[PDB]
Design a protein around this ligand. Sequence first.
Ligand code: SF4
Ligand code: SF4
Ligand code: FCO
Ligand code: FCO
Ligand code: SF3
Ligand code: SF3
Ligand code: F3S
Ligand code: F3S
Ligand SMILES: [Cl-]
Ligand SMILES: [Cl-]
Ligand SMILES: [Cl-]
Ligand SMILES: [Li+]
Ligand SMILES: [Li+]
Ligand SMILES: [Mg+2]
Ligand SMILES: [Mg+2]
Ligand code: NI
Ligand code: NI
Lengths: 264, 264, 581, 581
Amino acid sequence: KPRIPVVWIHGLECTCCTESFIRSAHPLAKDVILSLISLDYDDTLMAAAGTQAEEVFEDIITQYNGKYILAVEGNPPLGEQGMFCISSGRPFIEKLKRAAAGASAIIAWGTCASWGCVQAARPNPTQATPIDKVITDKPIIKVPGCPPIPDVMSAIITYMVTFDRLPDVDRMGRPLMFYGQRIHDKCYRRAHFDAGEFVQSWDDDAARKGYCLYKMGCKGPTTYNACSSTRWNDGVSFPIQSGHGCLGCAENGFWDRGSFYSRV
Amino acid sequence: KPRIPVVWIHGLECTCCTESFIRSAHPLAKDVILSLISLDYDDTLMAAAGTQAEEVFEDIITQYNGKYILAVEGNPPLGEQGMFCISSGRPFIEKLKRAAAGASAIIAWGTCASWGCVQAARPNPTQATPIDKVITDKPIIKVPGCPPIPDVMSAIITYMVTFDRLPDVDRMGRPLMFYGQRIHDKCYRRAHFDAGEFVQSWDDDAARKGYCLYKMGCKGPTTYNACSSTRWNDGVSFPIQSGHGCLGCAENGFWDRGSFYSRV
Amino acid sequence: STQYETQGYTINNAGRRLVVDPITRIQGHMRCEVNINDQNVITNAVSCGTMFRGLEIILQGRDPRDAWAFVERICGVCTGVHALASVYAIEDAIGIKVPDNANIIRNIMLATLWCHDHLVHFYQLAGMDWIDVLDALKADPRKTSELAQSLSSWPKSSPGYFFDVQNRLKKFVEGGQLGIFRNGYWGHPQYKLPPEANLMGFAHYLEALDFQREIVKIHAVFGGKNPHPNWIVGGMPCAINIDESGAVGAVNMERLNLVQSIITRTADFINNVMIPDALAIGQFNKPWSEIGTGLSDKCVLSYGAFPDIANDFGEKSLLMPGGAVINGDFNNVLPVDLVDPQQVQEFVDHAWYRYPNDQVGRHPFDGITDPWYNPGDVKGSDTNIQQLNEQERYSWIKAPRWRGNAMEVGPLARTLIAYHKGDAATVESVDRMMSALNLPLSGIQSTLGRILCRAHEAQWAAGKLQYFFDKLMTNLKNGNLATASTEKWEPATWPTECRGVGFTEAPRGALGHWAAIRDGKIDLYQCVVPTTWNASPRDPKGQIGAYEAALMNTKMAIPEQPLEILRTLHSFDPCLACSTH
Amino acid sequence: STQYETQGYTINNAGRRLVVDPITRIQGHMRCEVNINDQNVITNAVSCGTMFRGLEIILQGRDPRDAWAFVERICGVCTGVHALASVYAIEDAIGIKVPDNANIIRNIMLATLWCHDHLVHFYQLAGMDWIDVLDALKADPRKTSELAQSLSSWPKSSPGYFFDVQNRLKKFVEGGQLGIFRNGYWGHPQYKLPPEANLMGFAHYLEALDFQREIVKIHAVFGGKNPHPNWIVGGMPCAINIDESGAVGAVNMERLNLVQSIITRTADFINNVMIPDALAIGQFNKPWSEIGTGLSDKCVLSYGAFPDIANDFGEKSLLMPGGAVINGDFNNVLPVDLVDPQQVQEFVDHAWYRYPNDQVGRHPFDGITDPWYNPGDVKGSDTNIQQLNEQERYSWIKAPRWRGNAMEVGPLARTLIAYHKGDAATVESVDRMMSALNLPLSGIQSTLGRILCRAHEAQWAAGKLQYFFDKLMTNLKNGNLATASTEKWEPATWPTECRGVGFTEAPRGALGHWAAIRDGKIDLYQCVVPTTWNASPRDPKGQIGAYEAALMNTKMAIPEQPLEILRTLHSFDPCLACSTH
Ligand code: SF4
Ligand code: SF4
Ligand code: FCO
Ligand code: FCO
Ligand code: SF3
Ligand code: SF3
Ligand code: F3S
Ligand code: F3S
Ligand SMILES: [Cl-]
Ligand SMILES: [Cl-]
Ligand SMILES: [Cl-]
Ligand SMILES: [Li+]
Ligand SMILES: [Li+]
Ligand SMILES: [Mg+2]
Ligand SMILES: [Mg+2]
Ligand code: NI
Ligand code: NI
């Protein structure tokens, strides 16, 4: 049976969300690509370059007009007439708008596509702007994080394929399944928080016992994501488990909320 | 270089600890057996039976007198002159005593060997008795749980091999590394406990959000183990994560502390 | 010495007596004794369970909702099956119906166990009876690669791989620390594989030892941990949430994706490693299609298992068929009723228990577990058994019978029942398997057949995992998420007095738990477990159980090296803790 | 048109112009233009970075302790290396010395990234330039098995395996949804592997796609997550506790056991899959040992990396040597000083930035990042570029030079430096590789050589992982657990004004971060990254950078299909987000 067409485009970005996707443990990214979707355009993986890649993009969005899903990683810069991000000699925003117009729905992977992420941190030299401030007439599912968790990305994909619908979202467009609760609502160090048992300096006796990272700047109390439950890299760890407070990386504006080491 | 000799014996037991051992993810049990220790006697795995197995036992404990580690799974029954557990026609306790006499140290795997476990629950028909009440002149490391976590077992083995010493223990003989803290002091549902957010009946809305299991009888607040941090089966889950309260299975007497569904 | 006739055998305790104690590469504690005649053929066999714990006694007075957790600790090898039987029994007593997803998840738990337990048995327990590990050192790695590639598509077959396995074994043996291989039976004339097949088999032993750990991740998702997952009366505790806030706290799409990945891998391993190895053992050991028949051509029993219609334990629902055959009459598969007092009964005239009348058998609802260690004259003392007295009490295992008949249970039994009930898949599978070996159907009724049927069933169970997973996902796609019924969770909702039976097919055979509840507590809890049937001692008629029968008439090449006894015993996958509980 | 001479090249922009935009199978955004003569030979090459974000501007006024987290997001492919350079730079500025275990763990983080990044590049990014995926459909599975087994001991080589892979690919392309293979260069005359080698390589592409996910579990243990692990100024946040209460909250023996298991698996995969495949590509593409030389026989640069003596960044400490070669004189490996204002300088005369004097170079402590999009007299317009004007400003990438020389950085550069400094391991590995190919040492200075050196370095790094792990364990055995120095954590302890340099060898080459702190805040933060060097535009002398040089003089079989351009560009593993930051 044919597979659902997917076009994956890249604006200003670091490629962490694409990397995160290939770390999926179940289903393997290999199996997603071979068996669950038809990944029909992706600059990071595709054989064709240049004019041949432009032909793929054109052919897919034309033949599958109204039927493909658009995945976006990164964001468009509004500065310098958009020429802070150039594709095929034109502003990236032109490619985003053309891809969006034919899409049935859009997945904004990562904090860049969802909110702005590091390039939009003060003073935002390029006037980087999230996807939903440019594309205003399409469903957009925001999957924030820098990057989002690998098996969250693959679970959202499998959900959509299996159930043939978009995930239910909160008021910000984030899937309820993984973004409905705070990191701090499911944190294994919460017993220490509630007891007043805190790391006060790195590698102190508290740190060696896994005490709470609140006083070291943990932003878990204000951050919605699945890192403390699903965890990272086939469930091996998450930031807090390995001794660093949450940075807040799934939340809009997290770079400009003060130092990472200042208390929430 | 030669590997440390290990004799593994079995009293009254269900074999859960041996099965747990072979679930180890890192190091694989294969690699423990081939490269880290010399597993010189083990009724569950060894080729030899009967007289040939008796020959192995006698040869190893004689050749390696004072130099082998004794692993014990299960316990001796004192009822019926010991004949509730018979090995080579004689009470198991005789084999336990002979093996203990030559050992440098003893590992009591599981709640059976450590404390008694299910056969010692009321009314203890066989007068099942933990190892440390019979063997009183040897170092005994207690590794409780029904069974202990696979990767805890293998970590304790690797510690001893790498560091050439017994783990430091608490006042009950349990390794501090894995038994120093309560399940509840590292439980990811603690936020819910602290907020008064509890499952009240199975599959209620609270259960579907991962609320705390205290009102369903969870014994995590009185149980020392690593289940809520190291977790089970290559970190995949633990009892509470999959929706059942802790039974208390690492603690002495846990079968007779009232119903598993009565609150702490 | 004495002789008597039963079930077509002549039981004769003249001649040399051989003792095998401990029996290794089983779970728990067993002793076996035989007599051999002047032709080194077994003329008497004695099965003895050498442990007891008393779970039936410990269960008295417990809350019924807690029972599963206690009885799960009957055994950590067949882990989960006793919990399943317990929740079935308590739900049958009280009158609880569970939601469809709970039933489906319980069927996934059982199928996962079948895959795990059968795979580990084949390699870690029985494998060294068939594979000469030390002879693997003589293999040519290129010819090993050729053999493996002729049998299977499995990827791991390079000559370099087989050389690396061989070299690792060489270095393990060279310093004299042979570990689990010390003082084995290597070189015995009944080892018939060529060196290349021994190396291939050993490589696969190691692959299975690694891979088995993955299978039980399914149990960890739904049940929290393995060994000894968790369950509830009323369904399962693993609440589901796919598309709502808080799915991080429940079985969600990521958890289900993990389960699917394990299913696929498990089927792949069983189908391309275990199945071809089993058929190859068959090919090189065809005489063992004629050894160890025992009761498998006389009397076989299955209760049935895997109800596909939630809360329906009838014939139209159970995916693994039930039934009984007696008197060698496979043309009349008989229905089994676990409440009928004339069907399942246990005798203790040759076991270490007290009944008011030891000449009669007790149905489990009338069961009694009153331990009484009384070995009589054992040519030593009460604490030094030199020779069990099989004319008197000789085991901790009770003697179950069905309508007074001694039965075999387990994979071979089940396969025969399904075949003769006309299950089309089973008929086709068995016929194709025996055709491939160029053996008659009767060749399955043997020690070799037990092994072949176990492998068959691992393959079947791996397929059924996918079928059950798909059923679960269908329900989720239709918005049916329920995993527990709690209407009768509270004891104030229960009958003041009630009783029930929980039954299934554990890996080793027919399992039942009989429970009576009074005033909110367990009044009686009696278990009859598959190895209780198979390892049974004798009854008042002198009838022998499945292990003793399968050993009878067996030729031994070298009396002091009991390889033939081990082969046949191990073919049943004995679980002695289960048998005695 | 114009023509001029530089670095032994004749740069001539007469004739037909070809444009490749987008370049795919890279990170980030790149445009390449070339001119080709009547003989289909490249006479001019133009490297353009088509993105910019401005991290150097964003960092101003931040707390130095936070800088690592911002600059880590320069790139998610080379994830971690900017964080490492950053904590090095801030520690250099303030005067912080980290504990030995922190240094060891940082070295493990870096070696893990080298293994991961090099492996994925080989298969997922560069592989399809060498392997004709569609031609794999024509292979014979048995001949594929025989080829694989002749090259490696890797287990996964059965004929049935290769048949299964081939059939998966056949099914994939059967519905006409070719996905990442659509409109590729399949059948180009420069694809030289036989069908069986294409199928072998394709199988390995899939194996590497799966396996790479495991490598980064080391990052998850020590750094929380990958991509984008966590770090601190003063060491690492992953406190260690092996034998005390509360080890469940720290890096304990179980966590260390996980790390060891990954190290072993990673070395096995690299040594038995990637290494033999790289040599096989060499064997079938020997002409590519003479194509794409560029600057690699002229000017190469390494800063050095992997300090073995904690806090010592000198020659006696760095396990990966540093040095520079110019003028083709490999007999004179010169020392590099990152503070010397006459050594590293960046020019912007051909880039989209403002300087007070664009005819001079600025050392990074004097660096300026003032973006100015001014493409000048393009063909087309400023928002619709048909041809860049390489006589004016043509890129977001600044142009770094070393003592005024244009340099190549990365695996080949490092290999040449270490070889010519007499590093025994590097000399042995290179000599054995080139002997296996029957090629001269000069054959490494080429597009093929870049790929061979990358494979060499993956093997080198996998071995160093074990070395570092063993060093960590030795410290733990001696009771040395410390992972952070905190006596200068608080801003009040810092100098009021200070500056520092952090440097390393990222997978793609020499990386430096230059930081100035004043009054507790970042006053200046300038990055010069490996792809900044390699993808550099021209300077005031018209000197060309490594990519432009490597493309010069290349023959194209089919001008419209840029396979030769892709091969050479991909051989550097371009990271365009790194290059522009
Ligand atoms: S470590 Fe962070 S998320 Fe966890 S309990 Fe403390 S403040 Fe909350
Ligand atoms: S689920 Fe149990 S261990 Fe966890 S917070 Fe609640 S009572 Fe404590
Ligand atoms: N299978 C199994 Fe265990 C036995 N006998 C049970 O039930
Ligand atoms: N490797 C890498 Fe990325 C680049 N160029 C950095 O630093
Ligand atoms: Fe995956 S591109 Fe990486 S920076 Fe924060 S989400 Fe963006
Ligand atoms: Fe591992 S033998 Fe299983 S019952 Fe509780 S520890 Fe005992
Ligand atoms: S920093 Fe990001 S990865 Fe998770 S723990 Fe915090 S949301
Ligand atoms: S029941 Fe046991 S397995 Fe752990 S969560 Fe509780 S100590
Ligand atoms: Cl794109
Ligand atoms: Cl943001
Ligand atoms: Cl106990
Ligand atoms: Li029922
Ligand atoms: Li320093
Ligand atoms: Mg019973
Ligand atoms: Mg810069
Ligand atoms: Ni059992
Ligand atoms: Ni990069």
